Design a protein around this ligand. Structure first.
Ligand SMILES: *Cc1cc2c(nc3c(=O)[nH]c(=O)nc-3n2C[C@H](O)[C@H](O)[C@H](O)COP(=O)(O)OP(=O)(O)OC[C@H]2O[C@@H](n3cnc4c(N)ncnc43)[C@H](O)[C@@H]2O)c(*)c1C
Ligand SMILES: O=C1N[C@H](CO)[C@@H](O[C@@H]2O[C@H](CO)[C@@H](O)[C@H](O)[C@H]2O)[C@H](O)[C@H]1O
Ligand SMILES: *[C@@H]1O[C@H](CO)[C@@H](O)[C@H](O)[C@H]1NC(C)=O
Ligand SMILES: *[C@@H]1O[C@H](CO)[C@@H](O)[C@H](O)[C@H]1NC(C)=O
Ligand SMILES: [Zn+2]
Ligand SMILES: [Zn+2]
Ligand SMILES: [Zn+2]
Ligand SMILES: [Zn+2]
Length: 479
């Protein structure tokens, strides 16, 4: 029944399942992954079809509230909730069908997650897609922001494999999009973030699961000076040497700096590639992981304790503050400042912890960079580096200090070490690694840089009344 909620009444009338605010379902779906930014929705609809989504949207329109689609709910700013209280939430994780046709084209429902998807792709023709490491991530938010992982240097972003989708617009209409149909909306869905439309189904091209993948890890024992020289070497290497079939990211925390990634080939060939750079980077390191496995194998190497096959029964949480950054080749000042920050400004109380992922994002041999900033809404094709900053409170149930009041300064200063040295137009951030301290105006310019204005015009055309907007999303502004 729809006691005390006019939206639930509307959904009920349209035969659309919902969660009453007094139910356990509300507890599960209504609580964000990042408890530091949990929000209270106006209602939660649970669509099972494209029609249910449109019906849910109409009800949102009737109520005069904004509507937020939630895929896997892994957004760092809880944008599946709209990034604030009061939105109608459309929990889509009950819509996770994955079907691969004879052309190796995969149809994936808007609420499917990476783990489940990867399993289906493997089971249905031994296919694969380029995506992140977390099995819980929703395919939806992932592809709308890009989709970065250990296959990006070789196969680009998750969105570079998107060829079409079935979506529901702000006015509840249902349309099809592709490079030849509503091409402007399609462009926007490929990197534009949330708020353009609600995707009921995605259409992906796929590549055959590689017969062999060699995962690896290099452990360094570098001091301050060695960190600087190492990164400089790694940088020249990333731009002029690093092979297409090799991905890499640096795991960085208070006491370590490790290189890790996947290689689409054999261990012997990989060792021949790693040795020269390890030497160029000044030695003081060794290979701590080197194993040949298969697609399924590489996937299960980066789960970090997470269940692999996740659908609609998900109740995992964390309490943290994240940040990100994209940038071109760095000068000695940036690298030197970054290192000094780790060595002199990264002390945290017990119960608190941090890490940074230094991603070999662009470069000459990166497939990601083989696509121009004009080809999709993704606007960082010209950036060599991508970073993720993660500040977390492990014992949040007992103590969250310095949060919610403060704490942001730590990672913000960390980002600043590199960002402050860049020309305004080159400063950027990755929407999938959202920084919640940004204003809608700051966020738009950083997440979409050069493509912002075009995205705003497209947004103006497809959602002029910003029905699907969240707190930092592209706004409806016509040229
Ligand atoms: C928690 C978590 C996040 C991760 C992880 N690993 C990642 C990785 O290896 N690479 C990445 O590139 N990103 C990783 N992320 C970061 C982000 O969590 C993801 O990239 C996605 O943004 C998360 O997607 P999802 O879980 O679906 O997020 P929601 O918060 O539900 O919504 C995000 C956002 O976009 C909209 N949206 C989602 N789904 C749809 C559909 N079907 N249609 C329209 N819009 C959709 C939301 O409304 C919102 O704006 C690893 C971990 C553990
Ligand atoms: O984008 C990402 N995001 C997630 C976080 O949302 C990262 O996970 C973390 O990766 C860390 C190691 O880099 C682990 O120690 C930690 O437990 C684990 O949760 C993951 O490695 C990375 O791919
Ligand atoms: C994943 O879960 C779904 C539904 O619970 C199930 O149908 C599927 O077989 C599972 N995948 C596995 C474990 O192969
Ligand atoms: C970092 O620490 C140094 C001393 O170790 C201090 O001088 C500096 O102000 C700190 N930087 C910031 C802005 O936190
Ligand atoms: Zn009731
Ligand atoms: Zn409420
Ligand atoms: Zn090669
Ligand atoms: Zn300077």
């Amino acid at each position: 029944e729809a006691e005390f909620n006019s939206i639930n009444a509307c959904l009920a009338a349209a035969d659309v399942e919902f969660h009453e605010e007094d139910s356990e379902g509300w507890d599960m779906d209504g609580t964000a992954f990042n408890l530091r930014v949990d929000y209270d929705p106006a209602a939660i609809a649970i669509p099972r079809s494209t029609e249910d989504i449109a019906a849910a949207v109409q009800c949102g329109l009737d109520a005069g509230v904004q509507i937020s689609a939630k895929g896997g709910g892994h957004s760092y700013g809880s944008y599946g909730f709209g990034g604030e209280d009061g939105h109608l939430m459309l929990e889509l994780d009950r819509m996770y069908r994955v079907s691969v046709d004879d052309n190796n084209v995969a149809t994936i429902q808007g609420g499917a997650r990476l783990g489940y998807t990867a399993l289906e792709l493997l089971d249905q023709g031994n296919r694969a897609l380029s995506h992140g490491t977390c099995p819980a991530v929703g395919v939806g938010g992932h592809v709308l922001g890009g989709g970065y992982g250990f296959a990006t240097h070789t196969h680009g972003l998750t969105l570079d494999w998107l060829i079409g989708a079935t979506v529901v617009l702000a006015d509840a209409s249902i349309v099809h999009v592709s490079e030849t149909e509503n091409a402007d909306l399609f462009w926007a869905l490929r990197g534009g973030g949330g708020g353009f439309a609600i995707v009921s189904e995605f259409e992906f091209n796929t590549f055959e699961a590689p017969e062999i993948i060699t995962t690896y890890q290099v452990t360094t024992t570098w001091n301050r000076k060695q960190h600087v020289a190492g990164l400089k070497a790694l940088q020249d290497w990333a731009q002029n040497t690093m092979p297409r079939e090799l991905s890499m990211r640096l795991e960085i925390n208070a006491n370590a700096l490790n290189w890790e990634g996947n290689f689409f080939g054999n261990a012997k060939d990989l060792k021949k590639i790693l040795q020269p750079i390890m030497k160029k980077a000044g030695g003081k390191s060794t290979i701590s992981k080197l194993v040949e496995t298969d697609w399924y194998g590489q996937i299960n190497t980066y789960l970090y304790g997470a269940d692999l096959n996740i659908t609609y029964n998900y109740d995992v949480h964390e309490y943290f503050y994240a940040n990100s950054l994209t940038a071109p080749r760095l000068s000695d000042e940036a690298i030197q400042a970054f290192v000094d920050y780790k060595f002199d400004n990264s002390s945290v109380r017990p119960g608190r912890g941090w890490w940074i992922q230094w991603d070999f994002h662009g470069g000459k041999n990166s497939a990601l960079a083989a696509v121009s900033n004009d080809e999709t809404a993704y606007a960082h094709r010209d950036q060599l580096w991508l970073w993720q900053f993660y500040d977390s409170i492990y014992d949040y149930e007992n103590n969250t200090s310095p949060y919610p009041e403060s704490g942001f300064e730590f990672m913000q200063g960390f980002v600043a070490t590199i960002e402050d040295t860049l020309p305004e137009d080159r400063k950027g951030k990755y929407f999938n690694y959202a920084d919640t301290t940004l204003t809608k105006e700051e966020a738009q310019k950083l997440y979409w840089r050069g493509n912002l204005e075009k995205l705003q015009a497209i947004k103006a055309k497809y959602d002029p009344e910003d029905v699907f907007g969240n707190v930092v999303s592209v706004e409806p502004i016509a040229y």
